[PDB]
Every structure is written in C-alpha cells, then in structure tokens.
Design a binder for this molecule. Structure first.
Ligand SMILES: Cc1cc2nc3c(=O)[nH]c(=O)nc-3n(C[C@H](O)[C@H](O)[C@H](O)COP(=O)(O)O)c2cc1C
Length: 318
C-alpha cells in the first residue's frame, strides 16, 4: 500500500494565498503551485512576486506548513530564466512553467498552451529556467497533450526531460478539448510516464477517492494534481490519500465563515467577492445545501453583506 503525492493545482482568478491558507490547513497537500506570473520581455518587480506569492516570506510555505511553488507563463527564454532566478532568490521552492493554459500572445511572446504547437519552445524555455535555478531546487513543467491533437504528446514530454526538468504534470487533454470530461486520457499520461525517467504527475477529472484510484491504476502515476475538485470537496487530499469521507456541510460552512473573517482581517477589499461566489458555485456540484446558499450569496455585491449572510448561518442548528 503505496506512498502518494497530491498537489494543489494553480487556478488563476479562483485560488489565491488566502484560499491556499484555508485549504492547506485542512489537507495534506504535498505542494501548491501559484497562479502564474506573466512573463513577456521584462524582469518583474519584487512586489509582483510577493503579492502573488506571499508565502515567499514564510520560507515558501502556507501558514500551516505546506510548500508552495511559483509558476511562470511566457516564451522568451532569457526572461523566463531571469524571472525564474528572481522567484528563487525570493525563496520559491523551485519554479514551475505553464504550458497548459490558453493564453493571449502579447508583444510577440505567447505562452501556456500555445507553446504546445512547437515543443522546441518548451525545451528552450524550460532549459533556460533549469540553468538559472540552483541545481538542487526543482523545476517543473505543466503540459497538455497537444494543441488540437495528441500527436506531439511524446515530443512535448521529451522536450521537458531533455531540458533537464525535475518533473512533469500532464493535464490529460488537448487545448481544444478544454475541460470536457469525455476527453480525459489517463492512458496517454501512462504512455508518457513509461517513456520518461522523471516523475509524471497525472492531472484532470480527479474528483474523489475512486477516480484517483482509477487514474493511478491506469497511468501508473503515484502522484496526482487536483484542481476543480479541490474546490468541490474541500478536504479532497484526505479523501484521495486516505478515503476520508468528504467534509460534511457543517464543517465547510465553518470554513467559509473563516474565509470571510480573514477576508476582512487581510483588508482584501470592499468588493472582493468573486472568489467566494465562485467557491460556492463549485460546492453546488457536491453539496445540495450549497445551492440555497449560492443563490442568496450570488445576488450580493460587497464583502461585508456576504460575510454577515454566511457567518449568520448557525452551524449547530444544521
Ligand atoms: C478557472 C481556472 C483557472 C486555471 N488557472 C490555471 C493557472 O493559472 N495555471 C495552470 O497551470 N493551470 C490552470 N488551470 C488548469 C488547472 O491547473 C488544471 O490543470 C485543470 O483544471 C484540470 O484539473 P481538474 O480536472 O482537477 O480541475 C486553471 C483551471 C481553471 C478551471
């Protein structure tokens, strides 16, 4: 009965430092990846890295102690390398490169999924980052299987290994397959793993204990990355590693109350409401109780009204 790694996926516009703080304290995530820093042709200021990844000031860990890694998105090897170096100087435990997400091409620099059309770009990006990060810290890369087909999936994988990356996360879909459940190919993740000599972390459609078991049995990976599921089920790392039942509704309400108490405390803004609405939108998929709450919360505009709504729910009488 085997060791296993579970990583918390990066999620631009959904997961920030505060949500990472809350989730990690009720989970056993081995690592969270931050939402990406967009790299074009410039070294980004220290403020940008600290505000995206406050954990850099706590030895690259959430307050409960979970490691966090800074992600980059961009194409130009010079600048990835220089931003990679800055993330590490500031204390990031290694650095990740995003080759999975659809992304605008700004100033001739593409990024994310658009690199999947030309694996040589991934090789050059990742290799410059590997050369600029001290050799003992890791450099990871996240990929999809290709742009509009999986034909280049092994070329993408090789590019990452040959650049000297430490590990590879495979979102087992193409870019054009988006998030459609019917297209996840965990078997291709496995075919990739077999060919490589670095750890492959399986990603996509991992919702619960059984799905994770199924995914690992097919891919052969002893590591997985959970994204949307980590919001659907707040203790999903424990569900997946130990077959814990899903967090019961009264404990998730307690968690959201805490969200709103830290919301105000951190001074995160008078109209900082999107992530709390989004979280509830995800929680409808697993908890019938969250549909009523989401309705009452979605029509609200500001963080104070939303807090009173949520921290007025009596956890006992429930
Ligand atoms: C709203 C949203 C934002 C995302 N932002 C990022 C991101 O910043 N960087 C990244 O590498 N992946 C990002 N992803 C992709 C996830 O990391 C993950 O690969 C994807 O959701 C598949 O995992 P799942 O089926 O567990 O959710 C995002 C996904 C969603 C839905």
């Amino acid at each position: 009965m085997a060791s296993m790694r579970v990583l918390l996926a990066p999620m631009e516009g959904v997961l920030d430092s505060l949500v990472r703080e809350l989730l990690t304290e009720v989970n056993d995530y081995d690592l969270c990846i931050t939402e990406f820093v967009r790299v074009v042709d410039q070294l980004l200021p220290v403020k940008v890295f600290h505000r995206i990844c406050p954990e850099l000031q706590n030895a690259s860990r959430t307050p409960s102690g979970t490691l966090v890694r800074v992600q980059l998105l961009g194409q130009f090897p010079q600048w990835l390398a220089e931003n990679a170096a800055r993330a590490v100087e500031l204390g990031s435990w290694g650095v990740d490169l995003n080759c999975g997400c659809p992304s605008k091409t700004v100033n001739g620099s593409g990024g994310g999924a658009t690199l999947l059309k030309d694996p040589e770009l991934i090789y050059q990006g990742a290799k410059a980052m590997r050369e600029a990060v001290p050799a003992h810290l890791p450099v990871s890369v996240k990929v999809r299987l290709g742009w509009d087909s999986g034909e280049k999936k092994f070329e993408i994988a090789d590019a990452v290994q040959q650049a000297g990356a430490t590990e590879l996360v495979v979102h087992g879909r193409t870019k054009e397959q988006g998030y459609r459940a019917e297209h996840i190919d965990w078997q291709a993740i496995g075919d990739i793993r077999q060919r490589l000599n670095i750890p492959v972390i399986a990603n996509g459609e991992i919702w619960d204990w059984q799905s994770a078991q199924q995914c690992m049995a097919i891919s052969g990976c002893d590591a997985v990355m959970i994204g949307r599921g980590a919001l659907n089920i707040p203790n999903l790392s424990r569900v997946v590693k130990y077959n814990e039942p899903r967090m019961p509704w009264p404990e998730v309400v307690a968690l959201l109350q805490k969200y709103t108490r830290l919301e105000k405390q951190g001074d995160t803004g008078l109209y900082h409401v999107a992530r709390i609405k989004q979280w509830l939108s995800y929680l409808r998929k697993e908890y019938d109780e969250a549909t009523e709450l989401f309705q009452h919360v979605r029509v609200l505009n500001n963080s104070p009204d939303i807090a009173r709504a949520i921290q007025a729910i009596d956890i006992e009488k429930l």
